[PDB]
Scaffold this active site. Structure first.
Site: not given
Ligand SMILES: Cc1ccc(-c2cn(-c3cccc(CP(=O)(O)O)c3)nn2)cc1
Ligand SMILES: Cc1ccc(-c2cn(-c3cccc(CP(=O)(O)O)c3)nn2)cc1
Ligand SMILES: [Zn+2]
Ligand SMILES: [Zn+2]
Length: 219
Positions: A75, A77, A79, A137, A156, A159, A165, A195
């Site tokens: 996709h 984004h 990352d 996503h 992504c 989830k 996000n 992630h």
């Molecule tokens: C146990 C556990 C705890 C957290 C997570 C987790 C947090 N994730 C996350 C949160 C906020 C932003 C983003 C980046 P994106 O959605 O790709 O733009 C990714 N994604 N997985 C998984 C397992």
């Molecule tokens: C436990 C835990 C909590 C949070 C996360 C996490 C937050 N992520 C995130 C947040 C904001 C922006 C982006 C850049 P993207 O949207 O991926 O292009 C990534 N990415 N991983 C992982 C594990």
């Molecule tokens: Zn993304």
């Molecule tokens: Zn991502």
């Protein structure tokens, strides 16, 4: 500061690459992708965040005897697409869905050189399959399937504990799309999120539950 690029073997011919970056408010975050070996050649499943880690990724496998045949982004984004500029500048073929390429152009980002469309695309017949489950996503998100290993890179979209996000997400379609993904790859042995930890096919059920829950929340 940021941890180094990590590359670890996951299965035969299958590696997980993890890169990291600083995001405002979040701090350091991780991103997983794959490198898949087809005989003497390597394919990237998503690039690292930057040019510099994509080169370190590419170099690591070239130095071990594997030409980089191509790179596919799940996709738009950054990352999944951050290294596309670098790859292209090196004449390494990059792939993304037509929908991904639109969204890259629209954000002033370098596009994949090759594109594909529709539900099912063979990047490498019988070895690397790309599947489009529908918006979730992001509008363009696809997953990559390694049928010889029953490994699904979910990106992504996968989830299991919180949707992440939502800025480009489609909350009304995601349950649909998660249900289709679950029905199609319930036999996955390994499912690889962007992630979070690698898991089995239950990540498909938890993602569907989360998308339902997210759609419930928004009301
Ligand atoms: C146990 C556990 C705890 C957290 C997570 C987790 C947090 N994730 C996350 C949160 C906020 C932003 C983003 C980046 P994106 O959605 O790709 O733009 C990714 N994604 N997985 C998984 C397992
Ligand atoms: C436990 C835990 C909590 C949070 C996360 C996490 C937050 N992520 C995130 C947040 C904001 C922006 C982006 C850049 P993207 O949207 O991926 O292009 C990534 N990415 N991983 C992982 C594990
Ligand atoms: Zn993304
Ligand atoms: Zn991502």
């Amino acid at each position: 500061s940021l941890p180094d690029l990590k590359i670890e073997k996951l299965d035969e011919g299958v590696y997980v690459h993890t890169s990291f970056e600083e995001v405002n408010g979040w701090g350091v975050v991780p991103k997983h992708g794959l490198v898949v070996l087809v005989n003497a050649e390597a394919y990237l499943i998503d690039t690292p965040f930057t040019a510099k880690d994509t080169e370190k990724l590419v170099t690591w496998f070239v130095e071990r005897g594997y030409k980089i045949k191509g790179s596919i982004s799940s996709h738009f984004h950054s990352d999944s697409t951050g290294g596309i500029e670098w790859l292209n500048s090196r004449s390494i073929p990059t792939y993304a869905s037509e929908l991904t390429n639109e969204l890259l152009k629209k954000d002033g980002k370098v596009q994949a050189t090759n594109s594909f469309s529709g539900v099912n695309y063979w990047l490498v017949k019988n070895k690397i399959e790309v599947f489009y489950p529908g918006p979730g996503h992001t509008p363009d998100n696809v997953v990559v399937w390694l049928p010889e290993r029953k490994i699904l890179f979910g990106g992504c979209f996968i989830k299991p504990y919180g949707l992440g996000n939502l800025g480009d997400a489609n909350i009304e379609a995601w349950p649909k799309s998660a249900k289709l993904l679950k029905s199609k790859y319930g036999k996955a042995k390994l499912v690889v999120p962007s992630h979070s930890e690698v898991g089995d096919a239950s990540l498909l059920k938890l993602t569907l539950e989360q998308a339902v829950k997210g759609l419930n929340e928004s009301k």
